[PDB]
């Protein structure tokens, strides 16, 4: 029959308002405030956390403050292991109320909520990002959110910790928690290597032209939303590749210029004309490597016929010292994918190459280059096949 | 007086939490999951639907599963007619509770909710997209959401069906249901016809240059959000025009290049100089044709002085074989409008035309062309006059 | 201990569902409908307002309609003063219920809600944009929203009024109230002054080339979201500068062309070659002037090392009459900042300048220029340092 949830005679239940809050959170779970480690109250038998608020699949969880320590987690028996400190909801448990709403003594022992240590495979099997209490096909009764990597040493020592920032709704994303900017950078200058195909380093280090003969590796300002993307964990690809953490339709914006651009000089033999040199800037996705996503999670497989390379800018050098470009595209990206940008040109400097024979500031380079990568759409349901291949 | 809705002494009512959920849905109604046709349980007297959840102006509606058929709709008396299967809320009806919250026997016969067949004019007069239960000026008591076009044949046959995808929040738009991408495509190549003004086909078929003498009509990947736009229903305009289904401020992104671009060759007579040829890429809106929107709904009239054409790219060919371009603009668009892109240049190939005299790959063409159209703002209230004219 | 807010045994309270609605409003407070001044029912002793709905930090407030006047505010004692008409929540007050939910006589005198006159410093000390009832560090019990500037004259006269549009969620922003477009314009043409550095007027008046010898100040269509930005209040900077009203990561899109672009003519002395002229289009932020934000509010100080200028387009003129450009960047902006766009080139017209020696349509100018400024991210928490410097 046709059931009303929110109507005059309806009883509005707890799964109901939690389903509403989840919708209001754009189906994102995470710590809204606090819940960071309290090292001062952390011993070799206990792990302390500060007060705060989290939302886990629409269920509001609070660590209350008083007097500190705001909360204590038992670390007895944990040694020489890397574990995940998790906030878990277990709907098989019973919340025990006591006292009364008549006197001012009503309290609940929320046994459905736990702060616990899990290993990586156990967390993954019940991770909120892959499984749901509200799921249609495979509904779960137990769901977790990892807060910290906790590395326990020998018996009698305090452990080492690393915050799981993808699970904290810290800042930059309030209002649109599941979307917004994935990555962005300030303008940078990057020397073009004398090769046909090369990646443009988008992870905060560029090969900056500094003199007429030299370039040097130089940091530039970059930001990444850890919920959406991360720098590649393999050092070979760390300067260039992002790992996508969340499926979706993403917008890629690029702008900059090609400085000291090569071209065939106008001479009597070519009827005093500039001989343009072809170049292209491409964005690329690659999913050949599995388990690149956070916790080594299984990648989300793309639909059959998915794109791998897309031309953002494709043209010839125009005979000017510096030529600007700009491009905006929407592209599908999948959890576990690598994403990168490439500069492509010919290798014959006297015939087809956009680059010259110089080095540093005397050599062809990208100048004032910047990008923004933003999540603008999801790939749930039918969108996976209809929108996911490009 | 000043009334509190959510305060300590307030009674939080059913219209209240439904007004809250509607706000949380960005004022969009639609099926959240399931509610698709069940052909196996569909006869000549009954129409079956699978279980699911919908939100209609903040009211949560559920079709419950058990044992199937999840729900049955009486089709007796319906023959040789095209009807709309609708989910309707009727606040004039009474929801009948039975049993008690003390025993575990509390139930409700939700007479305020109906699954019914309506003709197009009846649905339009009570369509959620144009009328509201929460409306300020004209509050309604009955509101509907169309789910399927149902075409009944002769008495004794099962009917034909077509899903109304604009009313299903399927995928791509979760989190931002009333906004996001309206249309997008992968890069395509399109031959420039030897005319002053022509539309660029944005609907999935381009005239692709394939040889030195020929081009051929070729499909390219395209996606449209049916809630925001649709391909023009008239075959004359189907390759080029979109029909806007929702008022708003939209962002249009375009990028690509003009390949085999024409220019006056540098000769002794012109002092060995390239004679550039002017071209422009424009986006256009046209509202002369009424009833192009879904169901033949009345178009939303634009404010006095509304734009019709906007230059995205306006420049000269630079003497290169291929020249890239990019542009981003925000534009106002109205339900019922046609939206299209045009390429504009002179017609004299030896004087003012950006195109040459060649055909296929030897002729001037758009290369690596793509676009994204996205809804970024609404046109409610004062914005209609202040933001709606451009 | 671990407390559940939304669980089976939880009591869902009034601060709770107000915290939920605030989250659903993207932490924006404002009038959702009505609440505009009623001049017909306004005397020298009373100020009338029409019915409507507002949300103040998740608390729903309603002015009920009946018979009008929908509400009356006592103006006795107010004279020769500019005041702010404010809607205030005071949690120190007691809401007085009467009657019963058994009979149909339950009513509340909401003493926690006031419509009052405050001076600018008092409103600022309890303004919802800077302080919160739900605040972590400094929780408040009293919070206000300014609705109108009210200027009272001599005793016996009706006052003058000006709506505070930043506090009305009127239109353009429903669905994403705290984000969306900040400013946008239609295409305009603007004469380039014969100077090294100049601002591009983004506030609705351009110096339009009209003849071969003259340009004239001409209005063009522009829109600003008053919640996000405003035209500079100082006349010296009014044609060019925006004042940012809300911290965040903003997206700036620009497009247009440089028409009648200057270049060194190809002659036998330069081997029949175009001598390109460097130019750049930059966006800029400046926070040297305090109190530019609405009500003269204190500016939000940017993190150490914040950017001030960013190149959007940097290249040489290519020897064409008209050359197009486009650029998209994300930038951090702070409440109280000035934001503007600049055109930068050399001043020697025979050597390094992108501009020529002509005037009006015979002189170098921006053609088909437009922009969109959009709020795309916040700068709360860690994002302030990680994302706020660029
Ligand atoms: C299995 C493996 O290491 N594959 C890598 C892939 O991860 C990476 O994205 C790509 C970059 O060009 O190179 C290889 O394909
Ligand atoms: C009444 C009618 O058919 N008008 C059409 C309009 O629908 C369409 O948008 C336009 C395309 O250029 O051509 C005409 O104006
Ligand atoms: C204190 C003062 O008036 N400073 C102004 C600043 O407000 C403005 O943004 C800038 C524009 O270039 O000029 C000055 O710096
Ligand atoms: C041919 C090519 O693209 N080579 C890239 C190189 O530019 C990049 O620096 C390196 C690390 O990402 O990976 C290679 O695959
Ligand atoms: C002069 C002009 O713009 N002609 C267009 C044509 O390019 C387009 O293919 C056709 C169908 O959309 O409609 C015409 O109006
Ligand atoms: C050198 C420079 O940038 N001058 C600008 C000028 O172009 C602008 O018209 C005026 C008002 O905004 O402010 C000046 O600072
Ligand atoms: Zn649910
Ligand atoms: Zn996953
Ligand atoms: Zn956006
Ligand atoms: Zn309502
Ligand atoms: Zn309509
Ligand atoms: Zn709160
Ligand atoms: Zn402030």
UniProtKB/TrEMBL annotation, chains A, B, C:
Molecular function via GO: metal ion binding
- Amino acids binding Zn(2+) 3: 374
The entry's alpha-D-glucose 1-phosphate-binding residues are 234, 241, 338
Sorted UniProt keywords: Metal-binding, Zinc
A matching Pfam family? Lac_Phage_Head
- The residues that the entry says bind Zn(2+) 1 are 15, 19
Where would you find the membrane-spanning parts of this chain?
Answer: none
Indicate yes or no for the key word Metal-binding: yes
Q: Where is N-acetyl-alpha-D-glucosamine annotated to bind? A: 234, 286, 288, 338
Instruction: Give the signal peptide range.
Output: none
Q: Where does N-acetyl-D-glucosamine bind?
A: 199, 240, 342
Binding, Zn(2+) 2: 130, 300, 335
Q: Which protein is depicted?
A: Putative phage structural protein
Q: Print the organism lineage.
A: Viruses, Duplodnaviria, Heunggongvirae, Uroviricota, Caudoviricetes
